[PDB]
């Protein structure tokens, strides 16, 4: 029997700061126990200060991104070059995914950018289009390894103020872009150590009011 789905591995990670957001993904692409590529980008500048990744089955991921990019293009044509806000992108992506509710896009989608007050925004989707805004999300193969670390280190979960018995939580702070990139780099090194489908390279897209910047780092190639 023909199986229309495959699993191309990889992992992705979105974190929001006060006036920026990052979307990171490894650059490895796999099927079964083979490496297809050590550098196949997975995180894309979509226009209007929005970055997007759709991790899982890469063919579905590429189709989805391609359709959203096209959605942005037609949003400009039909609404007088108006900027597509991140909340509006999110809702549009829900309709793209839910359109294929009974033959789903086999991906976990994350978008990142700035909301309409200039604050960092991360939106996160399931394969059929349910979504939520968060400070914080990992998706893909190593999501189960990475998310709990992010719960601990971004939202300070289970951390209390020392000497308060256990009755005052560690207070929530926004993190600087330098502190976020550290958590991203450590998150991916940890995932590379323990997950066979994660490795090769890390590409981070950072979004500020000034635009989209890229950073790249080597990861272990085994």
């Amino acid at each position: 029997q023909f199986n229309p789905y495959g699993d191309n591995g990889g992992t992705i990670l979105g974190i929001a700061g006060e006036d920026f957001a990052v979307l990171a993904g490894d650059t490895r692409n796999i099927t079964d126990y083979s490496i297809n590529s050590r550098y196949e980008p997975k995180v894309f500048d979509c226009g209007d200060n929005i970055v997007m990744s759709a991790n899982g089955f890469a063919a579905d991921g590429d189709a989805l991104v391609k359709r959203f990019k096209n959605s942005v293009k037609w949003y400009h044509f039909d609404h007088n070059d108006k900027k597509l806000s991140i909340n509006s992108a999110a809702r549009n992506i829900q309709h793209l995914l839910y359109g294929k509710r009974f033959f789903p896009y086999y991906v976990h989608t994350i978008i990142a950018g700035l909301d309409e007050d200039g604050k960092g925004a991360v939106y996160s989707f399931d394969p059929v289009g349910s979504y939520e805004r968060e400070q914080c999300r990992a998706g893909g193969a190593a999501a189960s390894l990475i998310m709990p670390f992010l719960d601990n280190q971004v939202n300070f979960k289970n951390q209390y103020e020392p000497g308060t018995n256990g009755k005052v939580k560690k207070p929530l702070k926004y993190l600087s872009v330098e502190e976020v990139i550290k958590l991203v780099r450590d998150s991916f090194t940890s995932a590379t150590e323990r997950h066979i489908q994660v490795g090769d390279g890390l590409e981070i897209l950072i979004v500020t009011k000034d635009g989209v910047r890229k950073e790249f780092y080597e990861l272990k190639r085994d």
Binding site: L97, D126, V128, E132
Partner: protein, 212 residues
């Protein structure tokens, strides 16, 4: 998920949890499972996350179109029936939805309709819906009376979701609470179970099953 809605002397209480699951993986602890359709109408979500968000958001659009065309707020009966007739068209395709449509109109009074994806539509005074419904029912039915104060009814709704959050592996996160009156719905806060459990344990002298 655990969601509940009940009718009492002072209106309707609506309480839901905030957990999303992907099997035994906890996908989220912060999901919104209530939709504010209009200032007098609420929808609760249980089942497929996408199914619930998509179709209840769609329901809001159809309710808005009703008031443009008819120059009048949609009835709870009519709103619940738009959703129930919709899911009935999809019956057998695999939609997963358990919802309560809660609201007030002059003609109806405070009203709750249960609507699910097999097409069942029921008017009633008390419903708990989701994987944790039985846990909520146990606490809710034991302490329910028609004539609770607004303060006691809010607490019972909150306490019932907490009960489910504790015992049901697939419920938790926080409790989102609403009160619906003559004048519309009122939000009564998000209550993280991380703090709410221990507070309730100490003040109430309950949860003696736990090492505290």
């Amino acid at each position: 998920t655990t969601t509940l809605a009940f009718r009492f002397q002072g209106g309707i209480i609506v309480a839901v949890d905030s957990r999303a699951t992907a099997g035994n993986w906890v996908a989220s602890q912060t999901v919104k499972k209530v939709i504010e359709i209009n200032p007098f109408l609420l929808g609760t979500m249980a089942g497929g996350a996408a199914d619930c968000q998509f179709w209840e958001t769609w329901l809001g659009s159809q309710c808005r179109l009703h008031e443009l065309r008819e120059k009048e707020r949609i009835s709870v009966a009519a709103a619940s029936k738009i959703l129930s007739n919709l899911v009935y068209q999809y019956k057998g395709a695999g939609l997963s939805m358990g919802t309560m449509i809660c609201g007030y109109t002059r003609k109806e009074g405070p009203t709750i309709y249960y609507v699910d994806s097999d097409g069942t539509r029921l008017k009633g005074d008390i419903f708990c819906v989701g994987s944790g419904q039985t846990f909520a029912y146990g606490v809710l039915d034991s302490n329910y009376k028609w004539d609770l104060s607004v303060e006691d009814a809010l607490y019972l709704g909150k306490r019932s979701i907490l009960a489910a959050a504790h015992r049901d592996a697939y419920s938790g996160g926080s409790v989102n609470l609403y009160h619906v009156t003559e004048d519309g719905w009122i939000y009564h806060g998000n209550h993280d179970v991380g703090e709410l459990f221990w507070k309730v344990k100490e003040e109430e002298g309950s949860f003696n099953n736990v090492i505290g």
